[PDB]
Design a protein around this ligand. Structure first.
Ligand SMILES: CCCCCCCC/C=C/CCCCCCCC(=O)OC[C@H](COP(=O)(O)OCCN)OC(=O)CCCCCCCCCCCCCCC
Ligand SMILES: [K+]
Lengths: 186, 557, 27, 674
């Protein structure tokens, strides 16, 4: 019984106590930005990490993927997905509502809205959309922000993030940094 | 597409094998009870200080050591979760988990399941995460590997009666195998973007007037260990899709490699220990063929996806309903088959919203027994129960008496094998029956009809197989689901571990005759065939009734 | 739950008891 | 499978259909209790309180009763055939009459009685011509017997009164003498009667392998009982619940009823078939040990000797001509009426067409084969021509005032190098030459040993010669390990050596000299020419006195095991197709969506389940012939035999049920019952 109890207390220390303490002190030794949440500071307010995205609803701001979080969209205290299955007709009704809203807000872009903007996200805090979807918006944003198309596409290029190998993920726009760069670009 | 899914699979397996052969030799050295190359002074001083010693254990004492350690882990974990409002590292003063949720989370994390009805970011303080869940992640995975070490030593020993001592195997597996490799994967995630800090929940004034409250915590440590030890209990609610647990596609790839790092390394170490590597290769070929065909089916179902999206007005029928966007459907599909095949249980795309067929295959790979590359250690010994079954059938249709690696297989192994194989189908089916009869059980769905029943079957199926994945619509927080799933997980894990150890105890008292010229090779395309056949046939025969009312009926809907 | 369902549950449990009993013996 | 035995096993099945007699087959017991449950449901429907459609549940319960009746019938048929074989063996003994003496002294009026009624106190006479009817003790007189039934080599043996020959057996054939015996009730002198009584009763020891297989079938039955029973909650949630009758049908169909029912029939069929091969088993354990033997100590004599050695080379003592050498060797061997001398003369004529010798050379004095002289010959000339062994010829030439030339001995050493026992011929008092007589293998045995080598059974020779000739004959026959100067204790040592490795050992040894080895051996076919002390060692008892029979006992062992395994796979697989016949036609009213799995295009749900159950019963009665005549098998290498039985019965168990269920459904629709 002394082996069992001492082995357990010792693995409690080495894992629970020490191992988090070591990973946490190396984390703040080497990567003080990616480790502390990857915050995007400005002045003194913390305008949302560059990883958890936000709820964008203006008309001069790119739109991430719909949320389905617990309270107000993109609320990183529940970060649930949207477990509505395919059979559930409520998913088809929600997609119909979103497609109608999207189509009626972007009247110059395609009539067929990409699937990323129509659906939810596994996290609900998904910050990103494949550069196709971000490119789809461009008509509306160009109009709202009085920015020509060429520079807006340049701007999506600057804040997109191709993965390492071409098939481990898929190209990715970074909506938070993107919209912030827009506001700066004003 | 799928031209560039098959690359993903090829690179994933190739890299998994490259990373697994080395560590496979590592675990071969541990199984043989030879000091891992550098640690003999440290091992000696530490064991002498603790009280563990050289004395070995017979199957009863090994089993009782591992179960004493796990049950003690369960006691301390249940009490941490049940009093976390008395422990430090409370950034937001959080209440003590209720009795039912405490019991469910405790029994889940002790038994390597890491089922999660709570919401990690609003229900658990750090101290519980840091020194509760993660510690039991380490010890549940170390228990799994200590049991498969007992089994493999049982196969490679002759006429002994001792399976080496359990405290030494737990200490060497944790300290040497898991803590370093997990500290390394955790520094990798803390670079890629995961977070590893103890700050209070940081305020955020979004670029619009709105405001949100980012969570924080020790997430990268618990990620490295929740993958490497095939656990699944990530920090936040959408565990391995939250951008704070798995930030970019590259950490997603490191997490798939880590999900299979130890099960595959164990197969190679098993191949080594017996002296005939071809046994290890045999096992990997069986498990790989099942996994690859499975990922083919899933990737295909997803890329077909929801046709309503194409009718409703969308641009492509791809099923990006649950899935994340940093990952496509190819990578999320591969991660659903990887997470549920290996009993990892870390969802990366809410498994509910997969197209009916796309969700049958992971659900099925759970119900099969978590055989294909199963959880840390659980994979190999569950696979070996199916291998004893296949060896028995083959020996029975060759005239020989059953044999595997030279050791005969008499009735005392057959009873134990039949019971261990039984333990998980009986739990999942009896549980699905109990849930679908009691009113509380079937008032915790989100989708109606066929898929509605599929959620219950998949929840019970994950829990009793120790998977931890979940269809995530099923509100599993009501005391009924907590107790039901708690009992399911408990009896799943330990009900399998007790017969496995009885098998090892009864296989260490034999003597392995040489390989005559008339013993069917257990290595080669025909025996890997008959192993795949045994696994798929038993799984399909058992579960096609249950699956004909769940996914399939939805697919044909 | 109901007459029929209780008799059914009881009979299936009885047959599983007998079967496991046979699986734990040489008969 | 003839009518008489069929009807008798059918009545036996009906009488074995009661429940108290099938505790002991939990797969058939689940089919039985299911059948009872659905007949109760059927009665309730037919007149009482249930949903309706009394027929379909009465037809399902009728066909499930038929399934139980066919399982009981297959077992009853196997046992009936076994009883027939046993009674036929005993009927070899029942072909004899019995002459009972009124006065115990020899010479009196005796009446003929069938050879089964002789009991304690009787005094019976057995004279030349009859068969010994029963056992007993010799009290007066002396006869020579042939032990023909209890001895398959026909060698005679003298049986005199007042001595160690007072133990008399039953069934054998007597010779041209006479014997007065007293019938007794002491333990017999036959191992036939013992097993005959053993199997004829109502008992049978499950063998280890058939317990492992039952553990497999019971696990399958639990898994499917839980699945098909938990279909009721799931269904009942999704719509209108699945009936109980369709669920008992699905449960019975899935359960491995084919191998479930046939298991016992296979065991007793293997025993009966071996009994047909004339060897009297003792228990299924011994048959499956036969199935596992990795080495069989076949002694050289019996099978690898093919009688006695025959001449191979001509070696001259005086540089003589091979023609005159063979002529003088045959002339001298004409007086050797043993098989060896006849073979020497035959090989002489064959080698050089030296065929006949007229009467003019005759009018001689023939020297018969004698133990004292150890030499045979002919005194045609004034000199004596002789033929014998090397030692006896050297001793007789040294005794006959002659001498052996050194070249003769040098050539004898050459023959010793050849590995052949040398025979010598001497004319008068000067040696004529030596002839090399190498012993032949049976001729058609290297192939059978090769086949065994493929299966994984390393043959092993055991000879009394030296470790050169023994190796010669080994390579000549196609054996693996050979022993020289085989001494029984050394045989036992080798047996324990091969057992220590885990390998089972097979053996054939008569005579008490091999008794301890036999008892130590795992499959000991005690030949039925040896002492009762050797037969009682046991584990097998032959009757043809052919030591090669052990090979057939191994074929029967692996046939029995192959049958078990093969039908097991056939049953498990069989379930895959029964799911496509039952699932989409059980839920074709709850979930309409599931008609797409009805791939066989079965007619109607009701017809689909009635047809799946019918095919279940007809498979158990179609596979009897196979479960009684064993699974034919050629000895391919282990992996290739796995590949043949997986192809044949894996696709048996997928492609045969499709054809089965669809044809039964097709028939039902045509006749117009659905
Ligand atoms: C529903 C089932 C139905 C299953 C029925 C299909 C199986 C029949 C297989 C037939 C193959 C014919 C090929 C014959 C021609 C090809 C010749 C060649 O080149 O080799 C061929 C390599 C040999 O490799 P080897 O042996 O090591 O070589 C010689 C060294 N000694 O066999 C192969 O194809 C192996 C691939 C086959 C895998 C079969 C496993 C399926 C068994 C499933 C049954 C379930 C069991 C019940 C469980 C309760
Ligand atoms: K898990």
């Amino acid at each position: 019984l002394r082996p069992a109890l001492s082995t357990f207390i010792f693995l409690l220390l080495i894992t629970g106590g020490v191992y988090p303490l070591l990973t946490t002190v190396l984390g703040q030794w080497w990567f003080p930005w990616q480790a502390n949440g990857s915050l995007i500071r400005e002045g003194d307010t913390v305008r949302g990490s560059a990883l958890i995205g936000q709820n964008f609803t203006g008309n001069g701001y790119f739109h991430g993927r719909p949320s389905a979080t617990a309270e107000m969209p993109y609320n990183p205290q529940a970060s649930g997905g949207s477990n509505l299955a395919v059979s559930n007709p409520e998913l088809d009704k929600l997609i119909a509502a979103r497609v109608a809203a999207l189509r009626a807000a972007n009247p110059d872009a395609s009539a067929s809205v990409p699937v990323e903007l129509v659906t939810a996200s596994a996290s609900g805090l998904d910050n990103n959309i494949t550069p196709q979807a971000a490119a789809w918006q461009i008509p509306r944003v160009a109009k709202a922000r009085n920015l020509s198309v060429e520079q807006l596409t340049q701007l999506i290029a600057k804040y997109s993030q191709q993965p390492l190998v071409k098939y481990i993920g898929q190209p990715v726009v970074n909506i938070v940094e993107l919209n912030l760069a827009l506001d700066k670009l004003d | 597409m799928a031209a560039q899914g098959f690359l993903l699979i090829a690179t994933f397996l190739l890299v998994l094998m490259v990373l697994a052969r080395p560590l496979g030799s590592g675990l071969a050295r541990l199984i043989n009870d030879i000091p891992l190359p550098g640690t003999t002074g440290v091992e000696r001083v530490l064991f002498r200080a603790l009280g563990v010693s050289d004395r070995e254990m017979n199957w009863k004492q090994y089993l009782c050591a591992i179960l004493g350690l796990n049950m003690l882990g369960l006691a301390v974990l249940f009490f941490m979760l049940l009093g976390q409002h008395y422990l430090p590292l409370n950034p937001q003063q959080l209440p003590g988990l209720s009795w039912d949720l405490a019991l469910n989370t405790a029994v889940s994390f002790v038994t390597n399941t890491n089922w999660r009805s709570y919401s990690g970011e609003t229900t658990l303080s750090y101290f519980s995460q840091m020194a509760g869940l993660t510690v039991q992640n380490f010890l549940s995975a170390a228990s799994g590997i200590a049991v498969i070490f007992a089994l493999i030593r049982a196969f490679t020993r002759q006429s002994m009666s001792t399976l080496g001592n359990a405290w030494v195997d737990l200490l060497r597996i944790t300290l040497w195998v898991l803590v370093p490799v997990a500290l390394l994967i955790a520094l990798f995630f803390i670079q890629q973007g995961a977070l590893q800090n103890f700050l209070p929940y940081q305020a955020v004034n979004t670029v619009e007037g709105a405001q949100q409250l980012l969570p924080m915590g020790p997430v990268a440590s618990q990620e490295a260990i929740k993958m490497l030890g095939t656990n699944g209990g990530g920090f936040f609610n959408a565990n391995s899709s939250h951008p704070f647990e798995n930030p970019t596609a590259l950490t997603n790839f490191v997490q798939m490699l880590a999900i299979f790092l130890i099960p595959t390394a164990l197969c190679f170490a098993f191949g080594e220990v017996m002296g005939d590597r071809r046994q290890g290769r045999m096992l990997l070929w069986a498990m790989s063929v099942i996994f690859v065909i499975c990922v083919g089916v899933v990737m295909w179902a997803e890329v077909q996806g929801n046709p309503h999206l194409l009718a409703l007005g969308t641009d492509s029928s791809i099923n990006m309903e649950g899935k994340e966007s940093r990952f496509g459907v190819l990578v999320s599909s591969l991660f659903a088959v990887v997470t549920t095949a290996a009993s990892c249980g870390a969802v990366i795309a809410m498994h509910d919203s997969f197209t009916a067929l796309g969700g049958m295959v992971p659900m099925w790979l759970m119900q099969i027994g978590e055989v294909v590359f199963g959880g840390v250690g659980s994979g190999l010994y569950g696979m070996m129960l199916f291998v004893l079954l296949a060896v028995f059938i083959a020996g029975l249709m060759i005239g020989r008496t059953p044999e595997y690696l030279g050791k005969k297989i008499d009735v005392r192994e057959m009873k134990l094998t039949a019971l261990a194989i039984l333990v998980t189908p009986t739990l999942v089916l009896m549980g699905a029956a109990l849930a679908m009869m009691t009113d509380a059980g079937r008032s915790a769905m989100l989708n109606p009809g066929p898929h509605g029943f599929s959620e219950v079957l998949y929840a019970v199926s994950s829990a009793a197989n120790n998977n931890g994945s979940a269809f995530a619509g099923l509100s599993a927080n009501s005391p009924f689901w907590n107790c039901l799933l708690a009992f399911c997980m408990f009896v799943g894990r330990f009900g399998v571990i007790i017969p496995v150890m009885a098998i090892a105890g009864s296989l260490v008292s034999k003597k392995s005759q040489a390989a005559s010229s008339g013993t069917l090779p257990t290595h080669g395309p025909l025996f890997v065939g008959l192993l795949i056949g045994t696994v798929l046939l038993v799984g399909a025969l058992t579960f096609i009734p249950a699956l004909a009312l769940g996914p399939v009926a939805e697919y044909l809907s | 739950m109901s007459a029929g369902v209780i008799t059914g549950v009881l009979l299936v449990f009885l047959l599983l008891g007998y079967l496991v009993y046979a699986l734990i013996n040489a008969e | 499978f003839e009518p008489t035995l069929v009807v008798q096993a059918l009545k036996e099945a009906v009488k074995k259909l009661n429940p108290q007699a099938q505790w002991r087959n939990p797969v058939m017991f689940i089919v039985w209790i299911g059948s009872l449950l659905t007949t109760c449901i059927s009665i309730a429907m037919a007149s009482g309180a249930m949903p309706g459609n009394a027929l379909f549940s009465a037809a399902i319960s009728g066909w499930l009763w038929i399934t139980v009746l066919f399982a009981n019938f297959a077992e009853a048929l196997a046992e009936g055939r076994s009883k027939a074989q046993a009674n036929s063996l005993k009927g070899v003994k029942k072909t004899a009459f019995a002459r009972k003496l009124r006065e115990p002294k020899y010479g009196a009026a005796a009446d003929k009685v069938p050879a089964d009624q002789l009991r304690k106190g009787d005094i019976v006479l057995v004279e030349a011509g009859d068969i010994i009817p029963c056992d007993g003790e010799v009290i007066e007189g002396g006869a020579s017997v042939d032990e023909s039934a209890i001895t398959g080599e026909a060698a005679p043996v003298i049986r005199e009164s007042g001595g160690d020959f007072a133990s008399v057996t039953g069934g054998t054939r007597i010779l041209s003498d006479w014997l007065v015996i007293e019938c007794s009730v002491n333990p017999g002198e036959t191992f036939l009667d013992r097993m005959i009584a053993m199997v004829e009763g109502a008992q049978r020891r499950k063998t280890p392998n058939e317990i492992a297989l039952t553990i497999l079938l019971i696990a399958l039955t639990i898994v499917f009982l839980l699945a098909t029973a938990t279909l009721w909650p799931f269904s009942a949630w999704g719509g209108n619940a699945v009936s109980v009758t369709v669920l008992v049908a699905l449960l019975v169909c899935l359960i491995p009823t084919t191998i479930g029912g046939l298991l016992s029939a296979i065991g007793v069929a293997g025993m009966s078939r071996m009994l047909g091969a004339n060897v009297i088993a003792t228990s299924g354990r011994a048959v499956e040990a036969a199935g596992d033997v990795d080495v069989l100590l076949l002694d050289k004599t019996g099978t690898i000797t093919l009688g006695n050695r025959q001449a191979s080379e001509f070696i001259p003592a005086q540089g003589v001509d091979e023609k005159t050498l063979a002529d003088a060797a045959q002339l001298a061997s004409l007086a050797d009426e043993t098989p060896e001398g006849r073979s020497i003369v035959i090989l002489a004529k064959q080698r050089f067409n030296l065929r006949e010798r007229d009467v003019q050379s005759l009018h001689a004095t023939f020297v018969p084969f004698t133990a004292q002289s150890r030499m045979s010959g002919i005194n045609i000339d004034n000199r004596m021509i002789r033929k014998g062994s090397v030692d006896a010829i050297r001793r007789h030439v040294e005794a006959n005032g002659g001498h052996f030339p050194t070249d003769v001995d040098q050539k004898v050493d050459q023959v010793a190098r050849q590995g052949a026992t040398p025979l010598v011929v001497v004319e008068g008092s000067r040696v004529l030459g030596v002839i090399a007589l190498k012993d032949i293998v049976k001729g058609g045995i290297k192939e059978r040993f090769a086949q065994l080598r493929k299966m994984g059974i390393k043959t092993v020779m055991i000879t009394g010669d030296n470790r050169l000739t023994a190796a010669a004959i080994a390579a000549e026959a196609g054996v693996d390990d050979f022993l020289a100067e085989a001494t029984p204790e050394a045989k036992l040592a080798l047996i324990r050596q091969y057992q220590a490795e885990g390998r089972l050992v097979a053996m054939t040894g008569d005579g008490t000299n091999d008794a301890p080895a036999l008892a130590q051996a795992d499959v000991a076919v005690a030949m039925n020419s040896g002492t009762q002390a050797a037969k009682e060692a046991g584990n097998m008892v032959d009757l043809d006195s052919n030591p090669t029979k052990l090979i057939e006992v191994v074929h029967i062992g692996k046939q029995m095991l192959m049958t078990r395994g093969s039908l097991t796979t056939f049953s498990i697989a069989n379930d895959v197709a029964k799911y496509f016949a039952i699932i989409p036609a059980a839920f074709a009213a709850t979930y309409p969506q599931l008609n797409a799995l009805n791939i066989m295009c079965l007619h109607s749900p009701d017809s689909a389940i009635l047809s799946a159950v019918i095919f279940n019963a007809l498979i158990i009665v179609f596979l009897i012939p196979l479960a009684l005549k064993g699974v034919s098998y050629k000895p391919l290498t282990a992996s290739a035999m796995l590949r043949r039985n997986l192809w044949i019965y894996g696709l048996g168990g997928l492609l045969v049920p499709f054809i089965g269920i669809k044809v039964i459904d097709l028939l039902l629709t045509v006749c117009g019952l659905v």
